[PDB]
Amino acid sequence: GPLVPRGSMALIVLGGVAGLLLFIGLGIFFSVRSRHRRRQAERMSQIKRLLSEKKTSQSPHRFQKTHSPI
Question: Which residues in the chain are followed by a discontinuity, with C-to-N distance exceeding 2.5 angstroms?
Answer without folding.
Answer: none
